[PDB]
Amino acid sequence: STGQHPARYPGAAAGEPTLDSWQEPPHNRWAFAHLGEMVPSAAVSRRPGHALARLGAIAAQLPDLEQRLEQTYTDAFLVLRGTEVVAEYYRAGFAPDDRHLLMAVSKSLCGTVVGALVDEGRIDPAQPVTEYVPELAGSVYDGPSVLQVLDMQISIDYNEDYVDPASEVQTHDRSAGWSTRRHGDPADTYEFLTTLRGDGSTGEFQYCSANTDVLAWIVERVTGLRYVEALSTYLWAKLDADRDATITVDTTGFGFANGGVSCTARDLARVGRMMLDGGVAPGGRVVSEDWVRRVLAGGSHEAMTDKGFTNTFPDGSYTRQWWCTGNERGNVSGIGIHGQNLWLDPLTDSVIVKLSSWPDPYTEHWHRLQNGILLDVSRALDAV
Amino acid sequence: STGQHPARYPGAAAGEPTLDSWQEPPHNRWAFAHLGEMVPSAAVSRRPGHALARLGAIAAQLPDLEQRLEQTYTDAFLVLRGTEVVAEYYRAGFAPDDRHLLMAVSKSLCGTVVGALVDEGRIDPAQPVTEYVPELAGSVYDGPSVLQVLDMQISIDYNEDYVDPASEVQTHDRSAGWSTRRHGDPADTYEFLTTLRGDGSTGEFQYCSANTDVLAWIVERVTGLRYVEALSTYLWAKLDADRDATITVDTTGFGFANGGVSCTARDLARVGRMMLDGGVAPGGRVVSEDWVRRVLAGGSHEAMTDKGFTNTFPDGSYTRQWWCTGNERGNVSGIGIHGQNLWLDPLTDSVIVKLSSWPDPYTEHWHRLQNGILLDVSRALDAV
C-alpha cells in the first residue's frame, strides 16, 4: 500500500477514474473537461515552415551561433537579459509559443515547489522522508532526510541500462506511462518508488530521477494537492506565464515530476528570472531569498563524484535539484537529457533557455558542444 | 493491411512513433513538441469554485432556467444571437474558457470537413467509399456511396451492448485508445473499420459512429493530411477561435473523428455561426452555400426510423452528420451522448451550445428535458 493520495477530483475514490471508467458517473463530469489526462490527444490549431532567428546583439560576437544551434539540434533558444528578451531562435516547424518537453529541467521546478513549502514551514529538510511518507518505510528512502533527496545524496541500486527492460530506468518509465507496461510492473509511480533499495549509505551524489518523484510525493502529503495543482499554485500561477505548462501523469493522475513538464521557452525563462530576482515572481514570492542563495551557493563539492560533470566543471556540485557549475561565473543550471537547459548567469542578470532534441540522451560530445554555447553566450553578455 | 496513412511527422515510418519509441531519433524531435499525443497529460494552470450565470434577457422568460440547466448536468451553456453572446452559464469548477468533450457533436465537424472537400471537387458523394479507400473492399463499406456514409444509411452488424466487451461499440473504443486494449483487438481504428460487416442493404438510417471514422479516413486519403490537421485547415483555423480544439488520437495518431473533439462553448458556437452565415467564417469560406442549404433541408424522412428521435420529432431526419428535427422552426443540431448539442435556430439567427455530463449516455428522460430547454430557449428568442 502507498497510502493516501490526492483525489483526481473532489470526492473521487482512490485511483479513479481509470482509462476504463472515465465515461461513467460520477467521473465523467471531471473527465469530460480534462480528457487529455486520460487519453492521448492532439491539438487542432486555431491558426492557419522556416526557422526564426533573432539573435540580435550577440550575433556580432557569435557570428556562427545559428549554425551552432542547428548542430546541437536546437528547437527553441531564448536569452533574457534582465527583463528583456535579447535573443531568440526557433527551428523550422517550432513556433515561438509552442511547448517543449523539459525532461529533467522539470526537477528544478519540483525543487522550487519544495522550497516554497520549506519557507512556509510545511517541510523541514532535516526531517526523514518517512516523516511525510511513512509508506516509504522499508525502502531505500527509509532513513535519508528530505535534504538528502533534494541533493540526491542517497545510494540507490538503480540499473541505468535502458537496453534492459528489467532496469530501474525502464521500469520507472513503464510505471509512469511513458512506455508500454509489462506483466509484473508496479501499478503506478508511488508503488515503483517503494520497490527501490540501496546499501544504506548516503552523502555521495547519485543522480536518480526517482528522488524527484519522492519529493513530489512529499509535496502531495504535506499540501493535500495533486502535484499537478501544487506545481501551479506554488510556482506556475505566480509567473504571469503566457501559457499553461503541461505535465504527463500516470494512471493515478500523479505528475511525472522528474521529467514530464512541457512549456514555452519564454515561460521557462520566467522561472530563471524569478531565481535571479531573489525568489520573487510577478504573482508573489515563490521561494525565500535564502533558498535562492543556497541554490546559487552550490552543494558539497566532495559529494559530487560524477566525472561527466566535474571533467567540465571541476568545482561543480548539486543542490536542491539544480546543477551548480562552480565556475568563475557561478553558473547554475537546470538540465535535462537530449539538450535541455534553464541556465542562470547571475553576473549579467541573464537567463538562457535552450530546448533541444539531440538524437542521444547524453554523450560527452553533445555536452561539450552545448556547454560551449551556453558559456560563449553568457560571456557575450558581459560589459565590454 | 489498411494502406497509406498520413505520417505522424514529415518522413515518419508507418505507425511511428509508438509509446515505446517516441524518445528515440528521429521521432523525438517531433515528440518532444507534442508529448500529449503520446502520453496522458495534465494542464499546469497559469492562473491562480462558483457557478457563473449570465442568462441575461431570456432570464425573464425562463425564470427557472439555471435550475433546469443544473438538473440536466450542464457544464457549459451559451446562446449566440447573431454575432452577440446573449446568455451564458458555466457550472462551478468549469471556467468559461475551459474545453469540454463534444462526443458525437464531433461528427458534425467531420461532416463539415467533408463538405469543404466536396466543394473543392476532391470528394464526390456519389462515388463508392472504395474509390477513396480501396482497402475497405470486402467490408460493409464495399458498395455504399460516400453520401450513404454521410447520411448513415448503411445496414451494419454493430452490437450496441457496451456491457459486452465483444460488442462493436466497446471494441471501437479499445481500438482507438478510449479504453484498455484486449488480446485480439484491432491494432488501430483503420483496422477496426475493415472488420465491419452488414447484410448489404442500404437506404435506412442506422446511427453508427464507425461511419464518421470512415469519413475521416476518406479525408486523409484525398488530402494526404492527418485528420487532426485537416480538421484545423478546413475548419478550425478559419473560425477565429479563442483556443485550439483538441482531439483524442489512436496509436497511429488518427483522430477519433466520431466523438473525440474538445473545445470551448464559445468556440463551438463559431461553428454554428458559420452554418447560419451560409458556410462562411471569418477566415474564409468553410463550405458552400449549397452544402449548408442541404443540411438545413434535412435528409430523407422515410430513412429515419429511429423512434427515439421521431417520437419527439415526427418529421425528423439526418443528413451529412447533422440531426434535423423537421420541426416548425427547422431546428437542426449536432448531438453527442451525455447531453452535448450544437443547436441551430435559423429563425432567430441564433446558435445554442449546451455541453453537459448526464450520468447516462442516453435516456428518454434526459432527452425530453434537454430538448425542452433548447426549444424553450429558442422560442424565448422570437420577436414579440
Ligand SMILES: NCCCCCC(=O)O
Ligand atoms: N526516464 C525519463 C527521462 C527523465 C529525464 C531525466 C533527465 O533529463 O536527466
Ligand SMILES: NCCCCCC(=O)O
Ligand atoms: N464510442 C464513444 C462515444 C462516441 C460518441 C457517440 C455519440 O455521442 O453519439
Ligand code: NA
Ligand atoms: Na524557500
Ligand code: NA
Ligand atoms: Na460544400
